[PDB]
């Protein structure tokens, strides 16, 4: 078996199409996702053409080893896809119609800057290395690109599955390569983050602020220190569901900013006590009374600034 | 090897049957379940007809590669099933009786709204793609569909294993497809949740309410703060055994509601102190005395409302 | 290849034997165990008989594909066993002696009611499906059933490896089936549970009871609350090494019972304070003096009751 | 293919040799370790002997399927080794020189009595089963047993790789077996345990002892209770890196012993307070002054006793 | 198939080249990394040479089994690489051009001394064992060595991918071996460590130092003890992302040093109280006033010393 010969000096166009059957296991830390899909390929081989009159059949079914099949690979995969050939069908003119059902772990990097209010564009890169005889160029058959209705990705909303129709052909090791881009747009389901992380994290912060309505230093220390410990637990729980990013995330910004409010609340609680012991509770009272308004106002403005910068 | 030819213009009916041997590893986070079962297939291939007078044997046994076997696949699987052919038996009329024992991790979505007092309907989807020569339609052989008595799923009660007899015949990529639905009904064993999560989480809440029978603000802060920290541990322990859902779960609702009771208890504990220091313990006493009745009544009614909304 | 023909109308007896080489990875949560053992099979095939005086050779060695071998499978396995044929030897009369070394993950349910003072009976179920020509029945060759001396299972004491000699012959999908039961009796090594869980869990409880020799409510709150937090940590550490059972475990019972002692200690600590503030420390003293005797006595009796109920 | 015939009535000696290429993943909980090594085998087969004069070659290279190769297996392995044949070479006298590169997960039990100041002897057991024709005996070719210099095992110091030259010949299932022992001596790198576990665990204990220079019961309760909670965290952190042993470990002994010092410190702290309230601070002072000397002396002596018993 | 014969007595030079497609999963604890790359091989086989004028063809394509291919292996791999042959092309003179796309988990040790401000040199070792007929020597074809622009390693900056052109030729088990070194230089992205570990760990330390501006021993105990517990949580969180090293890491040094500051702060807090009770608050005040300057100065200098020693 060898590639079909060119009629003139034109490259062989292999029409592609991916139809997603099952979408699952999106690892945020590993920036991977597992896919189960159909792969449809179509090319013209004149050597396989026949007259439907003499042959007595309008279509001929072949085994993979019997005829020449182009070496189609995925760029961003962990290991080689678990392919299983469904059907190979030849038309009288010699147009081969290949179909296989595969499963692979895809390496698609994620952008956590707006986490957990982020949207992602997952990529599937189809590639073909040109042979010495003739060059192979990929094309998108929009009729054979899709996803079924039951495709669900846990914790994500599947927006669309499209393909960049124009391939990005390039030279690699003195041979041509045709690359295609299959984009799967998704958006995070941030609902669970509100009652599990955001709201309990805010309650522990407001509970620490009840120290501006107390003169008991021993109770204030317990209030601001204990709630800080709960924030450390929340900061740890968050950084376990996320990878180490060289940029600041939206949640990461808020979490880090809250570590300063706890630090300033400790300073205020110490100042109030030092002034009380120094027999000047008039200054201690005015600082405490100011903090009652300062802390919520600065916190609310700081969040408006952050949310503005991130969105 | 090619498909059997039609006597008239009828599609080939492949009679199916799944018999569950072992049911294991139900992942709640991944919404998967591993199954070890028998798969029985039956189709008429007249091309395999024989005379037992001549051949010597009443029933003929073939190897999988020897004869044509229909390409039966599962829709909702992670990877291709680990199949092992048990027996292929052809009768003189050509009726093939296929039997294989497989193992696959099935992708069946779960509903955690009533967790841990929820019931699920797990699905197994058999599918067959029609060939160019003739169409293939699936059928259920109710005699060969079941599960053995020893089938146990850890933490679950296995109700039934049935099949939707009428197949879903639909067009996919210009070819006909026959889909079958194998439903496995299960219900959760909620017993362990009561002494491990529900009751210890209630004890820590009632312990916080002993602050309504105390005038010691420093002891009250320790009481309401420390028990809130224990409740954060309980909220974390629960959200680790569950996936991030875009809906509110029953336990998630209760856990979140308890966060408000700790927040209001902190306000009461602060109010009582502020009034005591302001030299008006008559107001502080009446608020504290009211909270002794208010907190248990509101909590009891709020739970009746939630349980009503969820069930 | 086809099954040996019956001399009369008797079923083919396949003599079995499992010899455990390596026993490892007992997962308590998954109720699985990995095994590496020898499997010996023996049946009579007259078609393979030869004259000992003529042939010269006493025994004939065959390849697996050359001769007919019965399809022996395991019922309670995750996936198909990793078998490797060691030797196939035929006697002059036609008795075949098969030997293979396998490795499989076995699904054997566990009983945690007496945990960590529990004993288990692990099962290995051999099964054979009868063919259309003749029926196949399993038998135990007690000479070829065993385990080597070096077989160690981490955290467990291996008692015995026996087989239920009488097979379970039953009908499944219109064909006969012969099932064998290989039982491996083990008992847990509870030594590590005493200094790591039981004794530290008792020390934290007795430390909470030092609040019956204190009048300082602020110190008593710290004592009873802080120790409860440590007990929650132990309750969590325990439920992570165990699966969700629909029954009460022995440790689970003790752990849950201790939650009540903390709850009553909190009530006593609150009562003592309420009476002190109410200017009647005579009642507060008598309640505190009684609890010094009540708490250890009730705890000691409650444990005798539990241990009695469980053992 | 069949085994070489004996010249007299001598058993076939297969000369072995393992050369470790890569040593990795020593699981302490699972008592396993992965290996990547060369396996060299050598036996005399007269049936393959040739004259180098007429052949015109000093050596002859064969494929594995072409000639008879002895079935060499490993006793203590999880699954069958991932073998890849490097070279098969035959000398004119018929001496076969086999070489393969394998990878296997070895089951070698560990002794944690002196942990983390322990040394281990890892085992690799080569085994050969004798055939009906003639018996097979293993031998060590010390020239072909080694390990490369770059062999590193994370957290361990690799001492030596030697083999017990005399094989253990024994009967198993009516057939003779030749077993060889390849011992890999290693010793733990205990450096990381000192600043991460030992020293931080000692600091928290000495911090608890500052309660012998304080009369504030509320502060002493906070001191001894809080530090005990940190010790529980250290006790848990340690038991997660170790399997459940039916013996006491060196670290396990120290950790458990410290639990008693925390218990006696709580008793002393309670005694001091009870005596203070009972208006006899002269007794309370003498007990507190004694504990300042008693606690460090008893702790220092108790450690000398333990270290002596363990080493 | 056998190796090409030497024209004189020269060894066969196999020109190599690795082109990295995907770089992923760098395990710090396991000191491993998964790669997906192209492997290009080139050698001269005169037995395959042909005339380009009469043959009409300039290049001839062969199957792997058709022609002799050198046994190229990787030294530092877990298991054998998942290779898939892309193309085999022969030139008129007999120069073979092999290309395969592989995936393997590489064992490359890491240096954590400057963690998380460390840089690593990952290694890939190509090796070839010489045959009895002739010796095989490796060479680097710098034209076919590279990495694509999209190669991303989570949490790391990929500097370069180069190869040590001169191979290490050495004797192993009486046969010659040729080894090549492919070095992949990377540097850690330390950005995430600052707001998640470094800065929160510093805030809790400075919060403990507010005890130098307080006379309340009960509040000082709460301050220094509670913050130390948070530091233990940070020490644990760090030692989980790192393997047990026989050397001191930069973070490990800082974390351990901070343990001493908490220990000295506890001593100061005890000294201040003992002097206050001893009715000499003039000495207690001067010690407390000195510690206000001492603790930040000593900490700042100690860090300059450490950073100097490590960098
Ligand atoms: Cl691929
Ligand atoms: Cl280009
Ligand atoms: Cl090109
Ligand atoms: Cl399937
Ligand atoms: Cl099996
Ligand atoms: Cl093996
Ligand atoms: Cl390799
Ligand atoms: Na082909
Ligand atoms: Na077939
Ligand atoms: Na306190
Ligand atoms: Na057979
Ligand atoms: Na052989
Ligand atoms: Na070859």
Residue numbers in the entry:
A (entry chain A), B (entry chain B), C (entry chain C), D (entry chain D), E (entry chain E): 5 to 315
Task: Share the article's original sentences.
GLIC is a bacterial homologue of the pentameric ligand-gated ion channels (pLGICs) that mediate the fast chemical neurotransmission of nerve signalling in eukaryotes. Because the activation and allosteric modulation features are conserved among prokaryotic and eukaryotic pLGICs, GLIC is commonly used as a model to study the allosteric transition and structural pharmacology of pLGICs. Unlike the other pLGICs, GLIC displays a particular activation mechanism in which protons, rather than a sizable agonist, trigger ion-channel opening. Here, experimental evidence for carboxylate binding to GLIC is provided by solving its X-ray structures with a series of monocarboxylate and dicarboxylate derivatives, and two carboxylate-binding sites are described: (i) the ‘intersubunit’ site that partially overlaps the canonical pLGIC orthosteric site and (ii) the ‘intrasubunit’ vestibular site, which is only occupied by a subset of the described derivatives.
Here, we solved a 3.2 Å resolution structure of GLIC in complex with propionate obtained from crystals grown in a solution buffered at pH 4.0 using 100 mM propionate instead of acetate. The overall structure was similar to the acetate-bound structure (root-mean-square deviation of below 0.3 Å calculated over 310 residues), and no significant remodelling of the intrasubunit and intersubunit pockets was observed upon propionate binding. Besides this sub-orthosteric intersubunit site, we show here that the intrasubunit site can accommodate some of the carboxylates described in this study, namely propionate and succinate. At the molecular level, all of the carboxylates bind to the intersubunit site that partially overlaps the pLGIC orthosteric site, but only acetate, propionate and succinate bind in the intrasubunit vestibular site.
